[PDB]
Amino acid sequence: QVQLKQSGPGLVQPSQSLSITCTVSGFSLTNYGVHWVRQSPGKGLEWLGVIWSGGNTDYNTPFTSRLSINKDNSKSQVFFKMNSLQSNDTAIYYCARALTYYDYEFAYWGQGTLVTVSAASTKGPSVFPLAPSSKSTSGGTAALGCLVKDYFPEPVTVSWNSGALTSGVHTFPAVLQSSGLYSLSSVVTVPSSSLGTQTYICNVNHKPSNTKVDKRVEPK
Amino acid sequence: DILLTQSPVILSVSPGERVSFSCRASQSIGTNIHWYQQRTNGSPRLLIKYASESISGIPSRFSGSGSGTDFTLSINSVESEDIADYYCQQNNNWPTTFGAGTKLELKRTVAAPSVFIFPPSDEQLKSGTASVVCLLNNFYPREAKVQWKVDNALQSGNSQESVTEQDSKDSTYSLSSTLTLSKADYEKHKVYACEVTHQGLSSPVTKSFNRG
């Protein structure tokens, strides 16, 4: 199976450098070029450059002087570095592979790496239960969730029961509070009859702050 | 650079209907155009290469046509799974450039929200902050009103809303309204009510609790 896995998301201070590692498998960097594309709020999708099979690189024009791409064929790793970031360099960065060795139709993408350029500091979330009760149980169906509060920067991941519960799960888009910190809720609906039997746990991972929390959510 | 203009900005169709996305180039680019899908939280998925050529694993309902400067991506019978943004990419000229994307939204029948209200946790209260969450679950269409009342006082400016993207299975939305108070303020009051208004409700639904 062809795959590309990028290093995790995080903060970069203004005027600092971005480093992302792409680890590929299912093919050899000696036979394929690896491309970098980002996705920004303003410009949208924007091709940044490529490191070719033989090690040659091209960079899109405006990144000539601040982009460097390298790789280690043996380790199947491609390294992306970009100097002196500013706020508008906040984007999701991706690595991609084309269908053929020389081409640009991107059939394989990394999962992306959300990079935030900000002067602030990283802060993990506190995780609070959103407890089911009668005020949240209508017609045999109960709602329950986790409040994931006061973190920075995005993103944060939430799953339920280690991935085993996905049906009826809504994880809300984060909102920025006046504190400059993000907050979101993740909720799920389950049979009320299972509240006694089943354990419900929201798994929260804030990769930028290395905060992993498992919050058990119970009726009060 | 070649500028790719995708139009319109938003498409809204009903399931089973056919839909077309337009990609226009600022300069002739042959058939050197590729198309991508972006689902909620995903990376782009390649749908069509070189205007019209199939990609393996992609449903047959996806096709594309055009040459020169005027291109079309087509879904002959849209499914709810097709909710996504759609991008075109040119590579006749270096550097390769992408359009700005078109959003595909699905219509469905009206569905009233289920409303649930969640008091602050005793856990959160220990920090000197109270969040009161009001959930509106699985409704259509997106428009909804959440009005907050604390002891019959209308709350304003102290709540934030968040709406999920459209669900790929049932095409509904869910909404969270979060009311935020100091612990001190929260403690000084008793009746917390969120009131919900929606096209599918024949009258507003109120969910509420008394603190303790």
């Binding site: 709020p41 992306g112 888009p173 | 972006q38 994307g101 078109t102 959003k103 993207e165």
Partner: peptide, 12 residues
């Protein structure tokens, strides 16, 4: 439109 980095979806 605008590209939302949280949802990776267009936002209008």
């Amino acid at each position: 439109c605008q590209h939302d980095l949280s949802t990776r979806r267009l936002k209008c």
